[PDB]
Structure formats: C-alpha cells, structure tokens
C-alpha cells in the first residue's frame, strides 16, 4: 500500500494533518500567553493535544507510505521509501515535533504550554497542503486571498499573544501601554483579554493605527519591532494582491494592447471605416465568446501524442465521413488530423470564390456555410457541421477540366469555426503513405469521372 502524492487520498490526508497543524500554530502560543485559556479549558486542550499527537504519528507513518517517483516510476518498496523519508530534513523536523515534551508539564506546571512549541515544526506539511490546493482549486485567486487573510490573522494573533505576554512580564496596569489590570470587572475576562489584545496587535502592526504610546524603552523596542514586522507582512500582502490583479488583468491587457495596436495600424494605414467596424466587431465577438487565444498557442507545449489524442477526440468522426479518407489507414488519419488548423469566419465572409486557388480543404467543425452565385444574393445549398469541401482541390489530379480552382462560391452564413487542411500539409503527410497516396489519387479519379471533369 503506497499513497501517491498526485492522488486525492494524499490531499485528504494533507487536509487532515493541516487541521492539527493549524490548531497548534493558532493555539499553542494562545494557551502559552493567555493563562486562563490554558487553565479553564485544560481537559479540552489535553484531548486536542493528544489528538494532534496521534495525527502527527499517523502523518509520520504516511510519510513512509507515500511514494516518490524513481526513474519516472512510483516506488512501492518499503525500505526505499523509509530511507528516502529518513534522508530528508523532513524526518528530522517530524521527530523533533514529537519529543515527549508533554512530560515537562509535571516539571514545569500546567501553566507552561511553551514546551509544545515543537509541534510548530510541522509547518511544512501545512504549506504543502496549501500549495497543493492552490493549484487544485477552481478559484486560485479566491483561495490565495484566503491564505493571505489566514496568514495575517495568524500573525496578528501571534502579535496579540506576544503583547499580552509582555504586558504580563511588565505588569498589568503598570503603564498606559500594557494591557490593563486583570482585576477589572470588564478587563479580567479571557474573551476581553484575547479580543482586546487582537485589536491592539491590529493597531500596532500598522503604524497608522493610534494606540497608547509606549512608556519605557522595552515597550518602544517591541512597538518598533511590530512596526517593521507589519511593514514586511503587509507589504508582502499588498504585493501578493497586486500580483494577483496583474495576473487576472494580464489577459485583458494583452487583448486590449492587441486591439489598440490594430486600431493604431488601421488609423495609420487609412483603412476604410466599414472595415474597422468589422474588425472591432470581430474583436468584441472574440472577447464575448472567450476565444482570444488560438489553439496553436494553447496546444504548443503538449507532446505529439497528446495533441494527436485531442485531435482524434475532436475531428475523427468528422474526418472519417469524407469519401476519400473513408478507406484509409488510421496512422494517416492521426498524422492528417494534427495539421487541421482552425479558421473562424464572420457572417457574410467568402471562404473561397470562383476563380481562386484550391490549396486548402475546409472541414466544417462548427457553423453553417452556403453555396452562392457570383452576386451572392441567392443560396444554392446550405452546409452544416460535419460537412467538408475542397476535397479534390488539394488532390493533385492530372487532366482535370476544373483543376486547382473553386467551382463554387462559399459564403459564411454565421460565425463559422472550420478547420483547414493545406494541400502542402497533406502532401507532406502523404510522403509516409504512398499506398494511401495512390489510393486517394484513385478516389479523386473516380470522383472526377463521376461528374465528368476530365
């Protein structure tokens, strides 16, 4: 039994170990500083600490169970996994997190939870879970905001705990800066203690916030330290959010830069106004339907097998309906379907006119086309998705009466997304299948003899 890191069970365990790690990171210092928090809920804290220790041991067991990739293969041997875990610094951090330091409760009293700070050494598991679910979540920006909010909450809570500890060390009510006297009817409550300390740390991590000024030099040093810690933390948070906004606006900024560059080119080259209305309408269509990026730049890093698989799963049922590519080898279908490059045509666009070069075969993946006359007013026949034309224009057929020429006018009725296969692309794909080359030549021969174009 080996849990792979790229699976979902590893994710569920990462959450289930993050919960005690988050509990430790947010509660050990809280019980260490606020003595009433430790003392009053002693049994609950003991139960939660025992649960966290049990989950820590189970996570150490999982670290042995989890399998790394060796030569691109998952390791399932127990000894190799144990050695790989023990060689890393993570094993040292895990074993340091689980010193039997709860036995110092007898040697230091129940009011010293600072002995359990070693459980904070499992921070790396929490960060691993957070970085794993940042990529997993559908909303990366929302969870990154959640992480930033949780980080500043943890830092503010830690500063609150340290402020309460320093007020305890200096003395409650000794200065107007420290936490007030805990003998007060309203300020002696633990809830008031923690919440007012949280408010003070909120006011102190930002220099803007106004707080009772420090009296002695130790308070001034601590306030300056909090000032610079808050400078670092909140500058990091604002930089993170600014980077998020730059990332989410990067696509819009690139698209608007392209649109403005094309506008500048059309104004510079004195393009007619109707044509620039057509261009701007096309760009508004592209942004409305979220088709700003072409698939050439989308499937550019994928391997040939994966691009091939996507190309089969998109176009095989459409391409096998063609008469010439009916009785063809599947390898040629795989090689040809990779070369189908898309073109999107606006409504009223002439894909090809009579008197044009036939060097591309157009396959209607989406949209409706029409065979029209020279004027274009009337429509001869409509074509829908799954259709094809230009099958014989790309085929080099000798003696054709209407060779390498469009015999009909094709008009895009709507926004037609159709894939073209170039003649040179198909001939370069046919240098590997000469038998299929002459098979397609024979098919074109019978097609032209059927309509009498020889």
């Amino acid at each position: 039994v080996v849990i792979d890191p790229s699976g979902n069970t590893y994710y569920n365990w990462l959450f289930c170990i993050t919960l005690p790690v988050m509990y430790n990171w947010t509660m050990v210092i809280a019980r260490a500083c606020f003595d009433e928090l430790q003392s009053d809920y002693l049994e609950y804290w003991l139960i939660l600490d025992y649960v966290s220790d049990i989950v820590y041991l189970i996570d150490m067991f999982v670290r042995t169970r989890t399998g790394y990739l060796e030569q691109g293969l998952l390791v399932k041997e127990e000894l190799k996994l144990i050695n790989k875990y023990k060689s890393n610094l993570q094993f040292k951090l895990d074993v340091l997190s689980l010193i039997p330091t709860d036995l110092l409760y007898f040697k230091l009293g129940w009011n010293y939870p600072e002995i359990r700070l070693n459980r904070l050494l499992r921070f790396s598991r929490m960060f691993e879970f957070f970085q794993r679910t940042e990529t997993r979540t559908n909303y990366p920006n929302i969870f990154r905001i959640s992480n930033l909010v949780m980080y500043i909450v943890i830092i503010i809570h830690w500063n609150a705990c340290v402020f309460y500890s320093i007020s305890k060390a200096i003395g409650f009510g000794n200065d107007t800066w420290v936490y007030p006297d805990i003998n007060d009817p309203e300020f002696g409550r633990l809830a008031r203690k923690y919440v007012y300390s949280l408010y003070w740390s909120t006011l102190t991590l930002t220099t803007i916030g106004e707080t009772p000024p420090p009296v002695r030099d130790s308070e001034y040093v601590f306030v300056v330290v909090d000032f610079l810690i808050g400078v670092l933390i909140f500058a990091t948070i604002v930089g993170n959010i600014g980077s998020m906004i730059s990332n989410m606006n990067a696509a819009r900024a690139e698209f608007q830069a392209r649109i403005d560059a094309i506008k500048q080119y059309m104004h510079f080259r004195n393009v007619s106004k109707d044509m620039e209305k057509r261009v701007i309408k096309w760009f508004d269509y592209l942004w409305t339907n979220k088709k700003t990026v072409d698939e050439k730049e989308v499937l550019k890093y994928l391997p040939d097998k994966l691009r091939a698989e996507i190309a089969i799963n998109v176009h095989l049922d459409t391409l096998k309906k063609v008469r010439i590519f009916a009785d063809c080898e599947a390898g040629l279908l795989v090689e040809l379907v990779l070369k189908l490059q898309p073109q999107v045509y606006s409504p009223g666009d002439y894909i090809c006119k009579k008197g044009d070069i036939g060097r591309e075969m157009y396959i209607i993946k989406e949209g409706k086309l029409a065979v029209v006359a020279d004027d274009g007013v009337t429509q001869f026949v409509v074509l829908s998705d799954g259709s094809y034309f230009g099958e014989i224009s790309i085929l080099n057929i000798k003696g054709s009466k209407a060779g390498n020429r469009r015999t009909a006018n094709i008009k895009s009725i709507g926004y037609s997304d159709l894939f073209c296969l170039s003649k040179d692309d198909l001939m370069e794909a046919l240098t590997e299948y000469p038998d299929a080359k002459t098979m397609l030549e024979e098919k074109g021969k019978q097609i032209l003899m059927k309509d009498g174009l020889l």
């Binding site: 790229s6 030569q71 030099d217 300056v224 600014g242």
Partner: protein, 418 residues
C-alpha cells in the same frame, strides 16, 4: 591569489562583504553619532578605533584587493599587474574610492566614507549570483534600505528636537513614515515645504518597499502563473470541444509531471534564447555519449551527430502509453533519457518481451526507411513516466542533405542491413 578574479573564488566575495560591513558602519553609525550623544569622551576611543579600522579596510581594498582584479580587454582575460593597476585607475570605481577616503571630532567629517556604494552593488550582484532564490536577499536588502531610511529620519528628528532616546525617535520616525500629523504644525510656507518633503520621502520609501515586495512576488511566481495559465487555457480548450475526462486527465497529469520534473514546460523555448554554441555544448553534455554509443551512427561525421543533437526533442510519455503500436508506421528514433520502456511479446501482447532502461536507443532502423517502408515490428509501451529524446525521420532528412558523405555512408548502412 596573485590576481583574484572578481566573479568566482568567493574569498573575494567574503572580503567584499567585509567592505560592505565597513561601508554600512560608515552609513549607519555616523548619523547616530552626529545627532545622538554616544560619542562621549568616555568611549571616544572605541568609536575612533572602529572608524580607523573601517578606513584601514577601505585603504586595503583600494591597494591590495581592487588592483589585482582580472579584467577583460577586447574579450581577453588580462591578469598582469602593470595592466590591472592602470585599468583600475581608469575606472570610476577608483575615483569613488579616492573620494571615499578624503580625510577632511565631528562625525560629519566622515560623510564621504559612505560614498563607496559601488562595492555594495558589486557584493549585491555577487550574492545574487551565488545563491538560488535571490528574491529573499532582495527582500532583506529592501528592508535594510527602509530601516536605513527610518534610521536617518530618527537621527534628523533627534537633531531637530534640540532646535535610550534612540528607539523613541525611531518610533516617531516609523509612526510618521506615511503620516504628517505626528510632526508639529507648520506656521510658514517653508515649514510646510519641509513637512511635505518628509511625507513624500517616507511615502517613497514605503512604496519602494511595497513595489519591491510586488516585484519579488511576481518574479517568484512568474513560472507558476505561466504554467497555471497554460493549463487553464488547455482545460478551457478541451472543455469547449467536449473532450472526455480520460484524455483531459491524461493531459493534466502530463502537465503536473512536466512542471514538477522539468520546471519549464518547454525546454526548446529556453534553448532558442541561448547562443548556438551554448545549445551545441549543452546537447553534447546530455546526449552525445548516448547517441555516439549506437553502431548505426558510428563512423559518421561528428557534425552530423552534433546537428542531430540540436534537433532531438524531449517528449514525456505517460505510464502505459504506446510509444509505437504494432503495425504503426516508423519515422522516429526514441532515445530513453529517463524511465523504463517495454517491448512486448507473447500471445496478444501484455507480456514484456524485453525492458530497456535510460540511456538506450531503439527505433533507429525506422530512420532509414524511404516512403514509409519501415513498420513497427513489436508493441512498445512506457512503464511509468519516461522522458524520451526523439529524432524525426524528416529532421534527419533535413540534416543529411548538408552532409553528402555521411548521407551516402548511412545509405550504405541501410542497404547492408535492409
């Protein structure tokens, strides 16, 4: 070291760090002695001793460290004293070094001692180049600049207060970094000009802090953002065309494996930014031994091997992926750079006839077919993730037309074998 090179041999970096500490002393401890009274007659000897130690470090850097620096002239490394001394003398670095040791009880006489800032920039560049994740040091450096700005503001506030007590003025400096209210109210135009100047300098420091943090976050997550955007574009493309979840999950798993293993998602787009000599020498130190191990390419010209090394494309195959099916056309030579590959035999496949580890080459006989002559005689699958370097037959055809003797010899090998 009779002549240290400024780039490598990190003992020079250690000495430059010592010079940076001396310059940081001359930057930080001068205003706190000019404003605050720690320059008492009781401990004046300590301040003078450390200041003279910093001056000795400056003079030592001028004499016996900056002079013996290897320097490039016309692209050639030059390592002789009579030329290194003149090259250092002609540089602006020696001019600033001379200006930083002008001798003029007032610590403002040591104000030009802070003028050796080029040593700090050189040490910053060297520490950036030495260690990976240099954004951490950039964060530390920007924080040091902001602490120095607050330190200067604290010293100025203490000097203007007479017209511990250091941490109090520092607290007032941080409190009034982006706040003007803490400062006393102005009754003149001149006073509000300085108050606005103080506010603007503090906001400049705070915004440099924020902008450098934004820069560090953007640079440290630029690759992650690019990979996430590429993955999301691919997922949106597959969802638009209604790709089933099997192929989508295969594409995804390829994306995480390529991002975790390679870390760039495309090695070829990095190579085109390198010099061609860099590309060639990197292709040699990766695949030249493995390519030269095969007997089909032995006896061939070395430049033909070098040209095929540039055109070898790295492709990652998922677990249980058919690299080449039985009866499929053969037009590629697969070089297993990493991973396990299995050639299958027995009844109806599914039995590993032979397994091949990293560094082996198979399918080279498919490179020599003309007009799709070669067919894959056995099923081949990828046991686990594997990185194979692939050379297309068409790419070999474009390479072979530049080497007629090599092409003729390889065609003789084709005729002899098949």
């Amino acid at each position: 070291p009779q002549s240290i090179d400024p780039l490598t041999n990190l003992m020079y970096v250690l000495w430059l760090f010592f010079v940076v500490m001396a310059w940081n002393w001359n930057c930080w401890l001068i205003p706190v002695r000019w404003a605050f009274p720690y320059q008492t007659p009781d401990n004046i000897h300590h301040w003078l001793l450390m200041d003279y130690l910093c001056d000795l470090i400056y003079f030592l850097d001028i004499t016996v460290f900056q002079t013996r620096l290897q320097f490039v002239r016309g692209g050639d490394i030059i390592t002789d004293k009579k030329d290194m001394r003149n090259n250092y003398l002609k540089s602006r670095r020696f001019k600033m070094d001379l200006l930083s040791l002008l001798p003029l009880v007032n610590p403002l006489l040591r104000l030009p001692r802070c003028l050796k800032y080029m040593a700090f920039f050189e040490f910053n560049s060297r520490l950036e180049s030495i260690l990976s994740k240099a954004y951490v040091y950039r964060v530390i450096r920007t924080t040091a600049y902001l602490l120095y700005s607050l330190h200067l503001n604290s010293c100025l506030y203490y000097w203007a207060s007479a017209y511990n007590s250091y941490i109090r003025c520092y607290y007032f400096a941080v409190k009034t970094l982006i706040t003007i209210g803490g400062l006393p109210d102005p009754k003149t135009l001149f006073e509000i000009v300085f108050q606005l100047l103080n506010y603007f300098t503090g906001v400049f420091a705070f915004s440099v802090m924020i902008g450098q943090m934004r820069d560090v976050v953007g640079a440290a997550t630029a690759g992650q953002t690019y990979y996430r955007s590429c993955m999301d574009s691919t997922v949106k493309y597959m969802n638009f065309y209604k790709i089933p979840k099997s192929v989508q999950n295969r594409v995804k798993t390829w994306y995480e494996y390529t991002w975790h293993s390679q870390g760039m998602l495309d090695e070829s787009e990095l190579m085109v930014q390198l010099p061609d000599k860099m590309r060639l020498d990197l292709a040699i130190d990766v695949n030249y031994n493995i390519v030269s191990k095969v007997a089909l390419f032995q006896g061939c010209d070395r430049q033909m091997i070098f040209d095929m090394l540039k055109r070898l494309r790295s492709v990652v195959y998922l677990p249980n992926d058919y690299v080449c099916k039985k009866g499929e056309i053969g037009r590629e030579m697969y070089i297993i750079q990493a991973g396990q590959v299995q050639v299958l035999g027995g009844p109806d496949g599914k039995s590993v006839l032979v397994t091949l580890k990293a560094g082996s080459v198979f399918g080279e006989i498919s490179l020599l077919a003309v007009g799709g002559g070669n067919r894959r005689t056995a099923n081949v699958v990828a046991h686990g993730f594997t990185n194979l370097f692939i050379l297309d037959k068409k790419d070999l055809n474009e390479i072979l037309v530049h080497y007629p003797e090599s092409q003729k010899l390889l065609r003789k090998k084709a005729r002899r074998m098949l």
